[PDB]
């Protein structure tokens, strides 16, 4: 039956990338297992509500398939010494021998394993660093509650060489625009990808060099593929409706403020220590300075003034400290640009790199690749 031999690094890397997309549960006999397939290399497959496949090179003595515990296998491969790993299926058990170590793992029925879907045609590919940065940027604002599945996804809009990623939990909206290498026309499509799976595939070892998305061509149904470095994961697209986020963005701001990201983040962390159940932090904007305040007289009062480059009438606005720091961290820039209309309307956070620039009257919203729009709290 199945017998193969390969290095520990490649085996543990494949099993690791597949195991990073598998959530959990013990038994669950079939769904908690991982499939090892010798062919002519080695394929490691898993499925939950998203599939993960990792193809690596290996010496196949005899081909076949086998099903073993995913969590157990990932633990073994992670904790093994770096030596050639020998896997040999004996009857209903798997013999894994690496160096001085010998493991006998029981098996699960292979006949009950589902056939994994084939990834669609390649829509395009983009560098892995840009993919991880963008998905990590927009994913932070997605909804975590499956009761409203329209908010649990990331809106992916592809117009030709340009890709737009948007997600919102109703309290914050993160939009990131980027350029990629498209193999289609003129590729015009829009899909809603579940945020958790896309974020997991992004934060993992998918590359390698470039990440390839599979839809594939001209819209598409029903799945989105992610491919690279011999690793393939596919997610089923959400059939829900994403709100129109291009209309929710304000055209012009009444007041704009540019600050230092790190200074502001540390200030928020410091003042929020007295906040009531971490409710809100108050920002009082004046000429040249903003004043962060939080807490009440029963617990304690915190106040800090920060240097600001400010324009427009003074205004007082409050935010959720965790949401604001989430946006500031997701900007991945040295400075932040704050749009403000009123204290009940959202604020626009845009990245500012290190150096940049009407008076009284209003100011337009500059076009930046990433934007974090945050709703305020009542004063």
């Amino acid at each position: 039956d199945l017998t193969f031999r390969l290095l520990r690094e490649s085996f543990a890397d494949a099993v690791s990338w597949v195991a990073k997309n598998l959530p959990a549960r013990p038994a669950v006999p079939v769904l908690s297992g991982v499939l090892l397939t010798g062919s002519d290399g080695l394929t490691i497959s898993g499925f939950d509500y998203e599939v993960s496949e990792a193809q690596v090179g290996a010496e196949i003595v005899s081909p076949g398939s086998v099903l073993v515990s995913g969590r157990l296998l990932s633990d073994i491969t992670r904790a093994l010494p770096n030596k050639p790993v020998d896997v040999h299926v004996e009857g209903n058990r798997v013999a894994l021998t690496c160096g001085n170590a010998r493991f006998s793992l029981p098996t699960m029925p292979v006949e009950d394993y589902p056939t994994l879907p084939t990834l669609p045609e390649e829509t395009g590919l983009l560098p892995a660093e840009l993919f991880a940065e963008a998905i990590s940027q927009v994913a932070i604002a997605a909804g975590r509650d499956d009761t409203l599945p329209m908010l649990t996804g990331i809106r992916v809009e592809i117009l030709g060489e340009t890709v737009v990623l948007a997600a919102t939990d109703r309290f914050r909206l993160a939009v990131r625009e980027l350029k990629w290498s498209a193999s289609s026309p003129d590729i015009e499509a829009a899909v809603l990808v579940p945020a958790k799976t896309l974020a997991e595939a992004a934060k993992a070892g998918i590359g390698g060099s470039d990440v390839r998305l599979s839809l594939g061509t001209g819209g598409k149904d029903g799945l989105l593929g992610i491919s690279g470095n011999g690793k393939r994961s596919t997610t089923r697209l959400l059939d829900a409706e994403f709100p129109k986020f291009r209309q929710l963005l304000p055209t012009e701001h009444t007041a704009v403020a540019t600050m230092d990201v790190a200074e502001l983040i540390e200030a928020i962390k410091l003042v929020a220590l007295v906040a009531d159940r971490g409710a809100q932090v108050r920002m009082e904007f004046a000429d040249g300075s903003v004043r962060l305040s939080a807490g009440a007289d029963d617990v304690g009062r915190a106040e800090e003034d920060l240097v600001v480059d400010y324009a427009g009438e003074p205004l007082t606005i409050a935010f959720n400290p965790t949401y604001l720091t989430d946006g500031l961290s997701s900007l991945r820039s040295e400075r932040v640009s704050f749009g403000f209309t009123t204290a009940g309307k959202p604020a626009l956070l845009r990245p500012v790199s290190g150096d940049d620039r009407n008076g009284n009257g209003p100011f337009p919203a500059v076009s930046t690749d990433y934007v974090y729009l945050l709703m305020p709290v009542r004063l």
Partner: peptide, 5 residues
């Protein structure tokens, strides 16, 4: 906390 929509 206000809502976007």
């Amino acid at each position: 906390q206000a809502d976007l929509f």
